[PDB]
Amino acid sequence: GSIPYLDGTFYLNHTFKKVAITFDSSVSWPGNDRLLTPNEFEIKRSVDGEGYNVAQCNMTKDWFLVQMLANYNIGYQGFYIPESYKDRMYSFFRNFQPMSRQVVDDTKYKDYQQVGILHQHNNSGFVGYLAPTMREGQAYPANFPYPLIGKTAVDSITQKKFLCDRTLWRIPFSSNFMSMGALTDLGQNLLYANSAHALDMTFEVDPMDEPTLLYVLFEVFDVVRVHRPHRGVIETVYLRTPFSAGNAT
Amino acid sequence: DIRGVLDRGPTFKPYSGTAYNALAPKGAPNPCEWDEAQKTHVFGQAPYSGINITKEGIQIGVEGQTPKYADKTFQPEPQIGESQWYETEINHAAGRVLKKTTPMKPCYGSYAKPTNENGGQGILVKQQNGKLESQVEMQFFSTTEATAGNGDNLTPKVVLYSEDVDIETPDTHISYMPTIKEGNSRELMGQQSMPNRPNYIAFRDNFIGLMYYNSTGNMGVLAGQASQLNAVVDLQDRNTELSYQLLLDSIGDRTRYFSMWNQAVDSYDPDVRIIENHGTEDELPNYCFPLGGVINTETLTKVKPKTGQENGWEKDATEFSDKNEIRVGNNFAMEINLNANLWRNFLYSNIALYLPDKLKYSPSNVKISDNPNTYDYMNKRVVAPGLVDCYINLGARWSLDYMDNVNPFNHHRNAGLRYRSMLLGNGRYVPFHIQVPQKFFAIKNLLLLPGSYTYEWNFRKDVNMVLQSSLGNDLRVDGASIKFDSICLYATFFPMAHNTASTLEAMLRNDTNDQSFNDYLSAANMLYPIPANATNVPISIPSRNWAAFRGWAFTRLKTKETPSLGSGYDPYYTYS
Amino acid sequence: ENHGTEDELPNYCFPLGGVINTETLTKVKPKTGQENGWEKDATEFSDKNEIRVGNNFAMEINLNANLWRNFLYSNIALYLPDKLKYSPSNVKISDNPNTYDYMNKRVVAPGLVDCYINLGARWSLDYMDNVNPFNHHRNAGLRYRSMLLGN
Amino acid sequence: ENHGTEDELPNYCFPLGGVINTETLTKVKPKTGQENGWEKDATEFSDKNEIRVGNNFAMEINLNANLWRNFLYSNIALYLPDKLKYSPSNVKISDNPNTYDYMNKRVVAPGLVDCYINLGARWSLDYMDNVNPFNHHRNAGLRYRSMLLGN
Amino acid sequence: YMPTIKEGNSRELMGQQSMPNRPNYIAFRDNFIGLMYYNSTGNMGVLAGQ
Ligand SMILES: [Ca+2]
Ligand SMILES: [Ca+2]
DSSP states (O other), X not given: OOOHHHHOOOOOGGGEEEEEEEETTTEESXXXXXXXXXXXXXXXXXXXXXXXXXXXXXXXXXXXXXXXXXXHSOSTTOOOOOOSTTSOTTSSGGGOEEEEEEEEOTTTOTTOOOOOSTTOOTTGGGBOSSSSSOOBSOOOOBOOSOOOSSTTOOOEEEEEEEEOOSOOOOOOXXXXXXXXXXXXXXXXXXXXXXXXXXXXXXXXXXXXXXXXOOOOXXXXXXXXXXXXXXXXXXXXXXXXXXXXXXXXX | OEEEEEEOOTTOBOSBSOSSSTTSOTTOBOSEEEEEOOEEEEXXXXXXXXXXXXXXXXXXXXXXXXXXXXXXXXOSOTTOOOOOSSOOOOSSEEEEEEOSSSOOOXXXXXXXXXXXXXXXXXXXXXXXXXXXXXXXXXXXXXXXXXXSSOTTSOXXXXXXXXXXXXXXXXXXXXXXXXXXXXXXXXXXXGOXXXXXXXBOOOBOGGGTTSBOOSOTTSOOEEEETTTOOBOOOOOTTOOOHHHHHHHHHHHSOOSSOBTTTTXXXXXOOTTTSSEEOOOOOOOSOOOBEETTSOOOOEEEOOEEEOSSSSSXXXXXXXXXXXXXXXXXXXXXXXXXXXXXXXXXXHHIIIIITTSOGGGOBOOSSOOOOSOTTSHHHHHHOBOOTTSSOTTSSTTOEEOOSGGGSSOSSXXXXXXXXXXXXXXXXXXXXXXXXXXXOOOOTTTSSOOOOSSOEEEEXXXXXXXXXXXXXXXXXXXXXXXXXEXXXXXXXXXXXXXXXXXXXXXXXXXXTSTXXXXXXXXXXXXXXXXXXXXXXXXXXXXXXXXXXXXXXXXXXXXXXXXXXXXXXXXXXXXXXXXX | OOOOXXXXXXXXXXXXXXXXXXXXXXXXXXXXSSTTOEEEOOSSBOSOEEEEESSOOXXXXXXXXXXXXXXXXXXXXXXXXXXXXXXXXXXXXXXXXXXXXXXXXXXXXXXXXXXXXXXXXXXXXXXXXTSOSSSSXXXXXXXXXXXXXXX | OOOBOXXXXXXEEEETTSOOOOEEEOOOEEOSSSSSOEEOOOSSSOSOEEEOOSSOOOEEEOHHHHHXXXXXXXXXXXXXXXXXXXXXXXXXXXXXXXXXHHHHHOBOOGGGSOTTTTTTOOOOOGGGTTSXXXXXXXXXXXXXXXXXXXX | OOSOOOOSOOSGGXXXXXXXXXXXXXXXXXXXXXXXXXXXXXXXXXXXXX
């Protein structure tokens, strides 16, 4: 089938739960108490007490702000639909879908009765039995699913989630999560270019029953220079920083 | 930022059609039994096959050598029958049936809650000791000719389990009632059902009506902490919401949807307002054949030539059975017309129902309401499909005369409306949590500077204003409700460097760098009344100055759909 | 562009009343005393009760294939070159091949274009390559200009 | 995005010949000189005629629901995760869970996804979130690149 | 649907029912992905002065 690692067809972004980053194992990098939560970016809440969801979904406000900033420099002066030419096929805003629904509350509805698949006989007398084969059975009032509307509705609870495929999650290495140029202001500061550091990242994701892979792209500078001093001769020089790879006399 | 509890009322139905036994023919009844002049009659079906029948029930298997019988609570299920298409002989059939206490409804759209995990429905009752015990009776039937004789053998042939469910219909209604007289009787077997009209409900676009604008009674306040000098002054005729709509249209695209501000644009279908009627493509017929291929066969016997007789045709059954089945001629088949029916259903469902009320007529033998705003009245009227059939204004791009002045946004294909309704879920009780923007022009883009301010506002709790409703039911009557729980205010600060921010403040406090703001609509609004069947409206304006005018812009509205902004609560506004 | 049709499930009709092949029966109750004894009971139930044994009558039809077949015959097969059609029988027809009547009363067998031609292949019939594709009844512009004058 | 279907009217199918339940009848003319009573007549009318009494016989079918159900079963229910299907009976099947044969011969109950799931609710089935949505036959690009090579 | 596991032709076998196979396209990828080796030190390409 389609290989996401090659042709860019991703469908699992909606299963991350939180991310934490630390330089030198003791200094957190949201920096200097920026975010609403103290030490990490929270990308989805199940149970909220203080109301941090946005867009009628389950995405913390923050993460929404971080993505909008890092993709369109939008968010410090109110949110609005970005222009068409700045919103490509693989962008973030084109591929956001919030969804919600209601279901029966078993613990509260006093007549709840779990019925499996083997014993649901709606549309009974004019359709096959657990197969697309010939019709069977007699006609009879149905017993599934519980009504949710009308004057005899049942009690219910609500579930919310979101879907966001075809795009990567982004975190820019700037001071204020903006795109002010290719070479960021924090990639030049003396502290991050005249010493060394150790990096620790911690992801928390929802579980799946199959071995999986976590895909990380460190955005770096990769440059080639080409020189042609004579007839039929060509020399090249490669640079890739920070993750250097090359010889040194 | 707002949270709370919303109750959309018992007239919320977001889907066309129904959801139970939708495939059943709209006239077929349920297995029932009733009373006549006093004896009882029974009508029903028996699909299940068995092995042997005794007075304990119907055997369904052997456990060792001991027979095992049916479990009278959920045994033979309504959806299990035979499997081979070609009919065979069965001698020990069983089935279910409803007692005579339960009212009779058509199969179409009939529901009854389950009462035990296995999946059976039957009203449990109290025993003498505190306990709930089911009550299902058994009734046996034998062949008429067998009883028309002597009870030498007289073995039963069919077994019926009779019960009594708590039947109910949540979304359909009766479209034909043969007899007013109540109770179970022979006549009521003829009734027919049809589904209720779809009806969405949601918050409006951009949360119009949730905040109080242009009402000097409850004007908002934004002021210096110690000055107590209001900075927002609003007149009673500076319409604000429409201006925001126009501005949003002008500065950017509009067809796209942004969920955060509930930003979806109301719109009608481009093919419902105007009826492009090309007819249908039905050159070929579209028959339908018998499940078995052919069912009118006849019996025949193999015959072989004789020898020395020039015709001696003689019988022969040494290898071929004497009786074989064969069909002569073509096979039985019935006809339909597909595209005509599809087009006719579309026309009836999308145009015929939404006609002006003056063409419909009240039904017969069915009780109806009186407030012509209630959902009940809007739903139980009937309209003859002859007004708009598959042959109206053929070959013409045209719109019906009646449907011209009828609002086309009150509909069930208003994509914005259905999107906003689905965005809250399909239930009836919704805990909601939303964010609401700010639209006043003098503080829409104002850039504040260090200090302490007081900021206070007002919100509506009326249900006719803040919730739309594709039809118009006066939602105050229909029991809708909305209760606020808590509010919070959010703000975002650019992390600007300290000295640069100080310089910016110092430059921006010089009185030559004040701020200027202009409304987008930028006009004064006046409404005048027009009585019924009028034709001429004169208006006047007394002498005054006219410097720096710009022009006129007019339109026309129905009075039934225009609230009385300027007071806390307008009890005479029943539409939505 | 021929993907075929999606017809995994059958689409059966059903008798107007729900069942029409019933048969008569008489109520019987277990005779007390002797085991396996039964006797006629008519004190409360009529001697004529109608019951159906087994499934109910129903006829089968295929929907998606029929729709696609109708579309294919209507919008392509008719517009084939005149050299493939053949004159009808026992019906008077014109002789001027440019008339409306001649174009109308000629018949063309559906077998030339059915729901099984070039399955799965994005293709156009060689016959229709050299026939004007704008002389058609789906030409949106022509339809609009015709409706503008009236009907 | 399940809005239900528009089926406010019944769609019937009538007998091929118009009516099939005819019955025989015989002409009759009023007897004169009695103010009542009648008599037979065979001077001009054949004594055998066929006539139907009451309406004609027709069967019913709900149309839109069948199409919606076909689409729903064909484009979703098959692609469910393999842990919800049960192997068939009396059919030899492969055992390698990647072959086309095994992916084809597993069966799945329609009741899992019918015309009434999450009614009126814009939602996506949980079982289908973590299943690749680009492996499909409505994947337009794949279908195009497949038809380009031929059929 | 196979009513009986027997072989040959018998009365029961008349009841079986058929059903179509699932559709399944096969073609080259997008942009001919995978048709040329990249980023593999085993089979690195060469473009160089003769
Ligand atoms: Ca016969
Ligand atoms: Ca015979």
